Design a binder for this molecule. Structure first.
Ligand code: WL3
Ligand code: WL3
Ligand code: CL
Ligand code: CL
Ligand code: CL
Ligand code: CL
Ligand code: OH
Ligand code: OH
Ligand code: ZN
Ligand code: ZN
Ligand code: ZN
Ligand code: ZN
Ligand code: ZN
Ligand code: ZN
Lengths: 233, 233
C-alpha cells in the first residue's frame, strides 16, 4: 500500500510494510530533541526464519516490533544485524537478545556502541572493515561503502527482491538539509555513496534510514544534500 | 500526557489548551525536512473579544485555527500579533486578514518578513525598537528583550494570569541542541533572555515557541543550549 508516516504511528507502535515477497520494512517513531521522527529497518525471510535489520529505536519499540512481526508474519526472528552504532539501530538489542535473537554487528559498530554507552550486539561481523567490502549473510549481502553518516555504517542488499537498505547513509527525497552529522564523515560521504551505486546499480527499491522509500535516485539526492551542507556559508 | 504533542495532532489540525482563565495556547504541526514539528501560539481573551498571538504556521493550519477558536470559544478574533518574521509566525496572516482580523507586528518584523518574501502583517507596533522596550497591547504586554532567535523576536506577557509566551526565543526542556539559528544573534541571546527574567520574575507559566510549557526554568535551559552551541558543542 502507501508507506506509513509519523502522524500515523503513535510513539511505541510499529508498522510493517511489505516491499516484496519475503521482504518488509519496519517503521517506528521516536521523540528526539523536540520532534518526532520516523525510522526504518528491514525484515528478510530466511527460509522458515526471519533476519532482522536494525532495532525499532528503543526497548519498548523493539518489543512492539517483535509482537507485530509475530502478528503479521508469525515466523521466528533468529538473527539481527545493526547497521551502525546509534540508538535507532542498536537500542533494543537487549530485548532482542532476551527473546533469543542472535544479535550481530561489525567490530567497528560494537567498538563505537561501547564507547557511546549504547547496547552492544553480541556477535561480530567479520570481513567488512575496508571500504568496498561485501559479505554474505544468509538472504542478504552486507556492504561497507566507507564512512558516511557514521564511520561504521553498513548497507544491506536483498538480491532476490532487488531491495537496497541504505540505512542512515541515505536520505529520503523529502529531506533537503543534513540530519544529525555529529559522527559523519562529510568529506568521504559522497565517495561512499558512489561505491553503493557502483556495487548495486540493479537496485529497484531503496530504503532510507528515515522516511519514504524510492529508487536509486535517493543516492544522488543524498550526495546533493551532503555537499550543500559541506558548503554551508 | 496532558499538553498535546504531534502524535495527538494530525497535520492540518489545531488543538487549543486552556492555560488559565481567558488564556489558551494553540498547537499545530508542520512538516520540516521529513520530520514533524509542533508549534505554539497564544489566545488571550479581552472582554468579549480575543487577541491572537502568532499564526498556526501556514494558510491551511491558520484557517483550522480560526474554525477551532469559533467552535471551542466562540468569541471573535479582532487582532493578531506576530512575534517575529518567520513563516511559523506570519504564515497565515493573509488568511487572518481575509477573515477580518487586524494583523500586527513590529516595523522590524514587517521589514524582515518582506525581505524574506513572507506574508506581511498590516499594522506596525510602535515602541518596541530598543532592547528592554515594553508596550501594552490590550490584555497583554509586548516586550522586546533584544536579539535572540531572531533580531526582531518579541515575547508576550499576560499579567492577569502570570503567563509568559517566549516564542522561539525560548526552548522547551526536551530540546537540548540549537535548532534553526540561521537568523539568530547567538552573542546576544543569553543577555536578551536575562532581560526577560528581569522583567517577568513573577511568571508562573512559560510557553516556548515549540513544545511543552514549563516555568522560568526554560530560560536558563535555553541559555545553556545556546552557549553550548556558541562553543561548538
Ligand atoms: O539518521 C539521522 O540522520 C537521524 C534522523 C532523524 C533523527 C535522528 C537521526 C540520528 O542521526 C540519530 C542519532 C542518534 C540517535 F540515538 C538516534 C538517531
Ligand atoms: O523556532 C525554531 O527554532 C524552530 C523549531 C522547529 C522548526 C522550525 C523552527 C524555525 O526556526 C523556523 C524557521 C523558519 C520557518 F519558516 C519556520 C520555522
Ligand atoms: Cl546467541
Ligand atoms: Cl548463535
Ligand atoms: Cl486592519
Ligand atoms: Cl484596524
Ligand atoms: O541514526
Ligand atoms: O520560527
Ligand atoms: Zn545514526
Ligand atoms: Zn550466538
Ligand atoms: Zn538514523
Ligand atoms: Zn523563527
Ligand atoms: Zn486596521
Ligand atoms: Zn519557531
Amino acid at each position: 500500500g502507501e508507506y506509513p508516516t509519523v502522524s500515523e504511528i503513535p510513539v511505541g507502535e510499529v508498522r510493517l510494510y511489505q516491499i516484496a515477497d519475503g521482504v518488509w520494512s519496519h517503521i517506528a517513531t521516536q521523540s528526539f530533541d523536540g520532534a518526532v521522527y520516523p525510522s526504518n529497518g528491514l525484515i528478510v525471510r530466511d527460509g522458515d526464519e526471519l533476519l532482522l535489520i536494525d532495532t525499532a529505536w528503543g526497548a519498548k519499540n523493539t518489543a512492539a516490533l517483535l509482537a507485530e512481526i509475530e502478528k503479521q508474519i508469525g515466523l521466528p526472528v533468529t538473527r539481527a544485524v545493526s547497521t551502525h552504532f546509534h540508538d535507532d539501530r542498536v537500542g533494543g538489542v537487549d530485548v532482542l537478545r532476551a527473546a533469543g535473537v542472535a544479535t550481530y554487528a561489525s567490530p567497528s559498530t560494537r567498538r563505537l556502541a561501547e564507547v557511546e554507552g549504547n547496547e552492544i550486539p553480541t556477535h561480530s561481523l567479520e570481513g567488512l572493515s575496508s571500504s568496498g567490502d561485501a559479505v554474505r549473510f544468509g538472504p542478504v549481502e552486507l556492504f561497507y561503502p566507507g564512512a558516511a553518516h557514521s564511520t561504521d555504517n553498513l548497507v544491506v542488499y536483498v538480491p532476490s527482491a532487488s531491495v537496497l537498505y541504505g540505512g542512515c547513509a541515505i536520505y529520503e527525497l523529502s529531506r533537503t538539509s543534513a540530519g544529525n552529522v555529529a559522527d559523519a564523515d562529510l568529506a568521504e560521504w559522497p565517495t561512499s555513496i558512489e561505491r553503493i551505486q557502483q556495487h548495486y546499480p540493479e537496485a529497484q527499491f531503496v530504503i532510507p534510514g528515515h522516511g519514504l522509500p524510492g529508487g536509486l535516485d535517493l543516492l544522488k539526492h543524498t550526495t546533493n544534500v551532503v555537499k550543500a551542507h559541506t558548503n554551508r556559508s
